Design a protein around this ligand. Structure first.
Ligand code: MG
Ligand code: MG
Ligand code: MG
Ligand code: MG
Ligand code: MG
Ligand code: MG
Ligand code: MG
Ligand code: MG
Lengths: 100, 151, 99, 79, 127, 206, 114
RNA sequence: CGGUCCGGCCGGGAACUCAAAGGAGACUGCCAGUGAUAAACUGGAGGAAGGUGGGGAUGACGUCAAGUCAUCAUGGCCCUUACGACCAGGGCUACACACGUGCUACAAUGGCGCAUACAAAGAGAAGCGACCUCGCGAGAGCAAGCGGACCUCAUAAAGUGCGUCGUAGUCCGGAUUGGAGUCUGCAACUCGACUCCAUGAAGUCGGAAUCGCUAGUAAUCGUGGAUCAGAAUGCCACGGUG
């Protein structure tokens, strides 16, 4: 992927742990408590003022070397092409071609 | 079947009367790999056929089968651009397999309330030789006697 | 009470060789040793497209076999505890100590 | 469509609706907020809702309450 | 001592125990009729007790795990025959002829890449 | 047609892994990127130091890098002068403490990666590809190789139409899993593009 | 037999006979027979005039037949005069719920013409 | 076997099922026929397995200047206060049509209601989430266990038993649309999935033409996974009947 597209992801990770990990979660659980504040909360309104990129759902899983947003595998943090390349060199531990 | 010369798979006999011929029949009727519901239709048809024809459940099947059983059939062959129908004498094993297949197919094409009723009334029509299944042996006969010169 | 050792490794001829070390070290230094118990292997399978672009039917199929070994040592003798603690095991074998 | 736990509205547009009530009806309100739910405090106003290129002015009626602002601004040109 | 024989077919695994006297059949603490709702599945377990005579001659305590109706019924059939040879060993000749000694190695074939099933290939289009 | 990777297909049969560590789904991705990042640093730094293979194992919360090299003296330096500066930044990249081992490559003309990199470095010096290939084959065969195959792909000698040329001597049974086949790649970044070098060395069965 | 909306339910079982009314499906028909104290597997024969009027009073609670028909039509016409996306699609005889129009939209479009 | 809350549940037992490391076994080896006394084939014995036992991986020299400069890398060229870069809204989802691949059907070998027997293989801590409680329901609140042969996803469905419908555009089929909701997510108008109530299209088995599959296969029936906040009739994988 593009250098700018890779940079856009770093910003999306940095903002995700800054807000929506220790602050925005507190106002979302608060916007769910039925026992306290049923009309006057403003928490749904104050969640909007927070940066858009701060949401973890806005982050895209990309190949950690190439930046590829498609064909990703969470187990290796890589795309199918770079998974295969590392697999054939024996750089992925315990991984080999399987048959059954 | 070009080089490899294979035989035939010997199937287990009928769980009711120990007949291998009935086991071929239940399998021919069988659809979607539902053997339990396939023998249920064959036995209910045989129970309603023997009762309404004077017992002998195995023999009442054989009377209906003797009428649908073909003697000769045509084989499609292209010699010199033209398609010639060569009449060939059918083997005793396939004689029964075609007879059973046409009974099941003619009962499927019927308009009765159930498959057990459709099968029973098809076997009743075959025993007296006046149905869709006996006409399939009749059409096969007229086709063979026509191309009798190319035998 | 009892000392439970759970062993994990991607190589089988490395897990039961490092398990052989634990079983022998404990039974020699005088301790009641249950096992080596061979628990089920967790086979994580992965299917990846082999071509950089198009060619859907052309694929590579891999697996990671996670071998499981259970070593239960009944007698927690000081001669056994100290012998097992200062043991040099294969770097690719994970050891879980359960009290 | 959405969970009954609070209808959605953008704060920037909500403050624009409040400013239009007290100061009186002005020219079309230029907003890109197509996701916002129409509230009763909008009936009578002219909200210029974006379609991707232009701001479609929509005269807010009592029956438009509950619906989204983007329902009255066609996004695709078909002839 | 109990005469034992292991039997298996497909993903099913059956254990068969033989003790003389009566014609009792107990499958997973349940009756033969109570466990199998099909009479065809009931007859295949009765098959080893045809060539080798039994009406009220010997009892059988059986347990089966995995597979299905015919898988479990097929597994027990193989187990009884293995528990019958455990009791005599001269019964082999009668058991071979019927084909009950043979473990049916037919397992369900794996789904292959680019194929709809194990062999079923997706529909071909020329143009 | 297309051939299976000779190293990949032999993993577990007759060929070892270059990464032997164990990790759960949790840190497996993080460890794999750290492995790439450490290999990248060392390959760049020890480029002239003839590095053939890099082995990475993780004993508990540590990193044990084994640099297989045909020139250990340049890798080690003046009484550990160069090992210390490498270990210091490997520990920085990995996070966990670092330990570097140096394995000697005896006969480098029998090492696929060192033969491939030799042909690649030669092509970049403007050496004739046929000469570079013939020398690689001759050197391996005289030193006891049971067989060798060397391929050179793309714009050979600066030619407009790219060609794939190969030299083979001895036995190269690529279908025998039992066969010790050492396979590796290298890319020659020439003034007229990229030239790919593929080397196969048969060392005997079992 | 004659219940609420002029229609004449057949001499079939009670639950399926009541589904003949526009506005009463499987759930409403089951709820109507449970509130009136009538069995579901009983026909129109034996069901006297004293049992019919108690079902008529029960079915009268929800908007059925012509009363429901105009209620559905009014909500469609409301969207249309409103000028919303939903109304523009009821006006253009194309799928309202977001479904694809590139292919397969034949229920709303009607049979194709070259 | 000892003890019963009749649950392997607790002492125990290492028998068995199973788990997973090592090992044996099948080679036309034996017998017979055919065959140039050869190769080989055919049949039979023994055997769990018989003639490469079943399935997979494995794809020679080469062919199509075949596909990929948009995974990545890279020669040359081109933009470089723009072909770069940031943002909001929109589009990739448009709809007279045509073709390819699929799903669901047209039903009594079936629909529905109740009762009920038998799987395999996977996934899981920013996670799988029991039990309890509330809601017709999608769900919600409360809150155990489990980094897992222990806990959870998770009730397998076909099937079987009984009852009903009785060849009807139907108790078949579910499209489309109206009303009300649930959840994920800053946010479900364009353009999410699912539920409740109502609606009940076409379709009664498909012209010319055409495809897959040789055995645990086809056919049919459920189950799980990768990607993934959410979004499978696709894909990958699993067993049941057969
Ligand atoms: Mg780049
Ligand atoms: Mg996403
Ligand atoms: Mg109705
Ligand atoms: Mg073994
Ligand atoms: Mg081979
Ligand atoms: Mg071209
Ligand atoms: Mg229905
Ligand atoms: Mg074949």
């Amino acid at each position: 992927a593009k250098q700018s597209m890779k940079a856009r992801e770093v910003k999306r990770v940095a903002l995700a742990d800054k807000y929506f990990a220790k602050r925005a979660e507190l106002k979302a659980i608060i916007s769910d408590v039925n026992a306290s504040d049923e009309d006057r909360w403003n928490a749904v309104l104050k969640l909007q003022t927070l940066p858009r990129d701060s949401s973890p759902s806005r982050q895209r899983n990309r190949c950690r070397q190439t930046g590829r947003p498609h064909g990703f595998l969470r187990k290796f943090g890589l795309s199918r092409i770079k998974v295969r390349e590392a697999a054939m060199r024996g750089e992925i531990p315990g991984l080999k071609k399987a048959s059954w | 079947p070009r080089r490899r010369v294979i035989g035939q798979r010997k199937i287990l006999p009928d769980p009711k009367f120990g007949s291998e011929l009935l086991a071929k029949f239940v399998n021919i009727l069988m659809v979607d790999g539902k053997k339990s519901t396939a023998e249920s239709i064959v036995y209910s048809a045989l129970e309603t056929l023997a009762q309404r024809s004077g017992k002998s459940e195995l023999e009442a099947f054989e009377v209906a089968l003797e009428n649908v059983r073909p003697t000769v059939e045509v084989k499609s062959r292209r010699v010199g651009g033209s398609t010639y129908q060569v009449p060939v004498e059918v083997r005793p094993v396939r004689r029964n397999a075609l007879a059973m297949r046409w009974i099941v197919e003619a009962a499927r094409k019927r308009g009765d309330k159930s498959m057990a009723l459709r099968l029973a009334n098809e076997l009743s029509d075959a025993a007296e030789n006046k149905g869709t299944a006996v006409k399939k042996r009749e059409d096969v006969h007229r086709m063979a006697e026509a191309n009798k010169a190319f035998a | 009470q009892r000392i439970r050792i759970r062993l994990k490794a991607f190589d089988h001829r490395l897990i039961d060789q490092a398990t052989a070390e634990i079983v022998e070290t404990a039974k020699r230094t005088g301790a009641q040793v249950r096992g080596p118990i061979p628990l089920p292997t967790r086979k994580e399978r992965f299917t990846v497209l082999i071509s950089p672009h198009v060619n859907k039917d052309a694929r590579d199929q891999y697996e990671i076999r996670t071998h499981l070994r259970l070593v239960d040592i009944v007698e927690p003798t000081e001669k056994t505890v100290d012998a097992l603690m200062r043991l040099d095991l294969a770097a690719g074998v994970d050891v879980q100590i359960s009290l | 469509r959405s969970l009954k736990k609070g209808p959605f509205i953008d704060l920037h547009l909500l403050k624009k609706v409040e400013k239009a009530v007290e100061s009186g009806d002005k020219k079309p309100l230029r907003t890109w907020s197509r996701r916002s739910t129409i509230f009763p405090n909008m009936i009578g106003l002219t909200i210029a809702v974006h379609n991707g290129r232009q701001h479609v002015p929509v005269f807010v009626t009592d029956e438009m309450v509950g619906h989204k602002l983007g329902e009255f601004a066609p996004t695709r040109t078909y002839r | 001592n109990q005469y034992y024989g292991t039997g298996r077919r497909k993903s099913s695994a059956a254990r068969v125990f033989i003790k003389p006297g009566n014609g009792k059949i107990v499958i997973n603490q349940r009756s033969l009729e109570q466990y199998f709702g099909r009479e065809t599945a009931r007859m295949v377990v009765r098959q080893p007790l045809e060539l080798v005579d039994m009406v009220e001659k010997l009892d059988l305590y059986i347990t089966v795990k995995g597979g299905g109706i015919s898988g479990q019924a097929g597994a027990i059939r193989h187990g009884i025959t293995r528990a019958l040879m455990e009791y005599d060993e001269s019964l082999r000749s009668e058991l071979r002829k019927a084909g009950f000694v043979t473990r049916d190695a037919r397992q369900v074939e794996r789904k292959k890449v680019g194929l709809r099933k194990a062999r079923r290939r997706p529909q071909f289009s020329k143009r | 047609g297309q051939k299976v990777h000779p190293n990949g297909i032999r993993l577990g049969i007759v060929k070892p892994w270059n990464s032997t560590w164990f990790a759960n789904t949790k840190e497996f991705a993080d460890n794999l990127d750290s492995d790439f990042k450490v290999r990248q640093y060392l390959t760049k730094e020890l480029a002239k130091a003839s590095v053939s293979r890099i082995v990475i194992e993780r004993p508990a919360k540590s990193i044990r890098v084994t640099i297989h090299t045909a020139r250990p003296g340049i890798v080690i330096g003046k009484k550990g002068e160069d090992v210390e500066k490498l270990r210091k930044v490997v520990a920085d990249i990995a996070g966990v403490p670092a330990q570097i081992n140096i394995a000697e490559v005896r006969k480098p003309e029998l090492d696929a990666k060192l033969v491939a990199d030799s042909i690649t470095s030669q092509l970049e010096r403007r050496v004739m590809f046929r000469r570079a290939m013939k020398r690689a084959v001759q050197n391996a065969m005289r030193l006891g190789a049971k067989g060798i195959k060397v391929e050179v792909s793309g714009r050979l000698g600066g030619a407009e139409i790219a060609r794939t040329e190969w030299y083979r001597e001895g036995r190269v049974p690529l279908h025998t899993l039992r066969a010790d086949i050492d396979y590796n790649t290298s890319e020659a970044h020439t003034t007229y593009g990229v030239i790919g070098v593929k080397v196969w060395i048969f060392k005997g069965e079992i | 037999a004659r219940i609420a909306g002029i229609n004449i339910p057949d001499h079939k079982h009670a639950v399926i006979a009541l589904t003949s009314i526009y506005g009463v499906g499987k759930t409403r028909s089951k709820a109507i027979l449970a509130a009136a104290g009538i069995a579901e597997d009983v026909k129109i024969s034996e069901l006297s005039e004293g049992q019919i009027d108690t079902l008529r009073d029960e079915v009268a609670k929800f908007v059925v037949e012509g009363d429901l028909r105009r209620e559905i039509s009014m909500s469609i016409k409301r969207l249309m005069d409103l000028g919303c996306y939903r109304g523009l699609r009821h006006r253009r005889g194309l799928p309202v719920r977001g479904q694809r129009t590139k292919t397969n939209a034949r229920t709303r479009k009607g049979p194709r013409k070259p």
